[PDB]
Design an enzyme around this catalytic site. Structure first.
Site, PDB file in Angstrom:
ATOM      1  N   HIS A  68      -4.682  -8.084 -14.361  1.00  0.00           N
ATOM      2  CA  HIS A  68      -4.420  -8.857 -13.029  1.00  0.00           C
ATOM      3  C   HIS A  68      -2.773  -9.313 -13.170  1.00  0.00           C
ATOM      4  O   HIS A  68      -2.385  -9.698 -14.154  1.00  0.00           O
ATOM      5  CB  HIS A  68      -4.993 -10.292 -12.826  1.00  0.00           C
ATOM      6  CG  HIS A  68      -6.285 -10.439 -12.851  1.00  0.00           C
ATOM      7  ND1 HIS A  68      -7.254 -11.037 -12.303  1.00  0.00           N
ATOM      8  CD2 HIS A  68      -7.348  -9.190 -13.033  1.00  0.00           C
ATOM      9  CE1 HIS A  68      -8.521 -10.843 -12.315  1.00  0.00           C
ATOM     10  NE2 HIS A  68      -8.600  -9.796 -12.453  1.00  0.00           N
ATOM     11  N   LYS A  70       0.800  -1.064   0.133  1.00  0.00           N
ATOM     12  CA  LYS A  70       0.182  -0.081   0.137  1.00  0.00           C
ATOM     13  C   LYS A  70       0.593   1.130  -0.003  1.00  0.00           C
ATOM     14  O   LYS A  70       0.963   2.068  -0.831  1.00  0.00           O
ATOM     15  CB  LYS A  70      -0.925   0.010   1.325  1.00  0.00           C
ATOM     16  CG  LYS A  70      -2.028  -0.558   1.296  1.00  0.00           C
ATOM     17  CD  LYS A  70      -3.313  -0.290   1.903  1.00  0.00           C
ATOM     18  CE  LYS A  70      -4.676  -1.187   1.987  1.00  0.00           C
ATOM     19  NZ  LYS A  70      -5.406  -1.057   3.130  1.00  0.00           N
ATOM     20  N   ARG A  94       2.161   7.643  -6.632  1.00  0.00           N
ATOM     21  CA  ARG A  94       1.395   8.983  -7.115  1.00  0.00           C
ATOM     22  C   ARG A  94       1.813  10.187  -6.467  1.00  0.00           C
ATOM     23  O   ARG A  94       1.755  11.442  -7.083  1.00  0.00           O
ATOM     24  CB  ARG A  94      -0.180   8.546  -6.522  1.00  0.00           C
ATOM     25  CG  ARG A  94      -0.834  10.056  -6.397  1.00  0.00           C
ATOM     26  CD  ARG A  94      -2.632   9.580  -6.110  1.00  0.00           C
ATOM     27  NE  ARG A  94      -3.153  10.907  -6.144  1.00  0.00           N
ATOM     28  CZ  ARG A  94      -3.614  11.573  -7.454  1.00  0.00           C
ATOM     29  NH1 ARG A  94      -3.696  10.858  -8.591  1.00  0.00           N
ATOM     30  NH2 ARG A  94      -4.258  12.624  -7.415  1.00  0.00           N
ATOM     31  N   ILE A 120     -19.787  -4.833  -7.912  1.00  0.00           N
ATOM     32  CA  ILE A 120     -21.237  -5.261  -7.650  1.00  0.00           C
ATOM     33  C   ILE A 120     -21.460  -6.795  -8.451  1.00  0.00           C
ATOM     34  O   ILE A 120     -22.105  -7.441  -7.530  1.00  0.00           O
ATOM     35  CB  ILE A 120     -22.024  -4.179  -8.647  1.00  0.00           C
ATOM     36  CG1 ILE A 120     -22.090  -2.978  -7.913  1.00  0.00           C
ATOM     37  CG2 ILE A 120     -23.270  -4.726  -8.838  1.00  0.00           C
ATOM     38  CD1 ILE A 120     -23.097  -1.856  -8.645  1.00  0.00           C
ATOM     39  N   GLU A 169      -1.803 -10.556  -5.458  1.00  0.00           N
ATOM     40  CA  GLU A 169      -2.591 -10.139  -6.796  1.00  0.00           C
ATOM     41  C   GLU A 169      -2.613  -8.808  -6.636  1.00  0.00           C
ATOM     42  O   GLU A 169      -3.468  -8.163  -5.909  1.00  0.00           O
ATOM     43  CB  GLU A 169      -3.786 -10.925  -6.857  1.00  0.00           C
ATOM     44  CG  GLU A 169      -4.758 -10.476  -7.861  1.00  0.00           C
ATOM     45  CD  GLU A 169      -5.587 -11.331  -8.370  1.00  0.00           C
ATOM     46  OE1 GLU A 169      -6.833 -11.147  -7.883  1.00  0.00           O
ATOM     47  OE2 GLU A 169      -5.419 -12.207  -9.350  1.00  0.00           O
ATOM     48  N   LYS A 217       4.308   1.676  -0.561  1.00  0.00           N
ATOM     49  CA  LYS A 217       4.966   1.565  -1.562  1.00  0.00           C
ATOM     50  C   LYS A 217       4.176   2.078  -2.933  1.00  0.00           C
ATOM     51  O   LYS A 217       4.698   3.209  -3.520  1.00  0.00           O
ATOM     52  CB  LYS A 217       5.658   0.289  -2.161  1.00  0.00           C
ATOM     53  CG  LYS A 217       6.499  -0.103  -1.014  1.00  0.00           C
ATOM     54  CD  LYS A 217       7.084  -1.694  -1.225  1.00  0.00           C
ATOM     55  CE  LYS A 217       8.080  -2.284  -0.538  1.00  0.00           C
ATOM     56  NZ  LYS A 217       9.384  -1.497  -0.745  1.00  0.00           N
ATOM     57  N   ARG A 257      -2.254 -11.154 -16.487  1.00  0.00           N
ATOM     58  CA  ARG A 257      -3.387 -11.552 -17.313  1.00  0.00           C
ATOM     59  C   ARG A 257      -4.145 -10.503 -17.702  1.00  0.00           C
ATOM     60  O   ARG A 257      -4.946  -9.588 -16.957  1.00  0.00           O
ATOM     61  CB  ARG A 257      -4.262 -12.585 -16.541  1.00  0.00           C
ATOM     62  CG  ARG A 257      -3.773 -13.884 -16.438  1.00  0.00           C
ATOM     63  CD  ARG A 257      -4.668 -14.526 -15.803  1.00  0.00           C
ATOM     64  NE  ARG A 257      -4.172 -16.034 -15.590  1.00  0.00           N
ATOM     65  CZ  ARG A 257      -4.475 -16.863 -14.594  1.00  0.00           C
ATOM     66  NH1 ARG A 257      -5.437 -16.839 -13.662  1.00  0.00           N
ATOM     67  NH2 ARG A 257      -3.961 -18.269 -14.399  1.00  0.00           N
TER      68      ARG A 257
END
Length: 198
Positions: A117, A18, A25, A150, A136, A20, A103
């Protein structure tokens, strides 16, 4: 099986990944450039979901760490479809993790699920030594994430076997998701230009 212990290095890994990933940004913004990353979420996969995946993929507990890919799960939210490849170039050139699988579900008919992914091996130092865990990373537009979030909940409840109305609602909604993204990316250079007036 003692989960609280097995899971510990994955809890740590999500926390480091997180911080890193949130710094990419910060860097773009400090250099006053457009940032491919908008924000970053992430969590360890719940104990029940691990067990299901174990039943479904046939992974014994002794092979969890070496064989299960998405125990730690991360999400990189990007603004434009186009920002995905930039996030990708960054991820592949990092040295504190190694990319071991990609992927593409973005070029994947303008409809259905849309996401990218990446699986990474991440070395995490614990008080009892180093552990190589797999995380992942999914990369998504805001709209992609809205839909996937959703469809995923509805899916749980129905176990992948949707009513008719749901089904077509999910597909219809999915195409609207794609259109919104497809439209904005086209004026993307213009929007970026406007935002870069901070």
């Amino acid at each position: 099986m003692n989960w609280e212990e097995f899971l510990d290095p994955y809890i740590q890994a999500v926390g480091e990944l997180k911080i890193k990933f949130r710094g990419i940004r910060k860097q773009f913004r400090k250099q006053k450039r457009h940032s491919p990353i908008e924000f970053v979420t992430g969590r360890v996969k719940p104990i029940e979901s691990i067990k299901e995946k174990m039943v479904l993929r046939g992974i014994k507990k002794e092979n969890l760490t070496q064989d299960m890919q998405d125990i730690a799960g991360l999400r990189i939210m990007v603004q434009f479809v186009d920002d995905v490849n930039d996030v990708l170039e960054l991820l592949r050139q990092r040295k504190d993790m190694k990319v071991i699988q990609e992927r593409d579900y973005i070029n994947n008919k303008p409809s259905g699920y849309r996401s990218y992914h990446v699986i990474v091996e991440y070395p995490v130092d614990t008080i009892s030594g180093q552990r190589i865990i797999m995380a992942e990373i999914q990369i998504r537009t805001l709209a992609m994430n809205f839909w996937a979030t959703i469809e995923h909940s509805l899916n749980y409840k129905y176990h992948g076997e949707f009513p008719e109305d749901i089904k077509r609602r999910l597909e219809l909604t999915s195409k609207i998701a794609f259109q919104l993204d497809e439209e904005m990316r086209q004026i993307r250079d213009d929007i970026k230009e406007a935002q870069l007036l901070f």
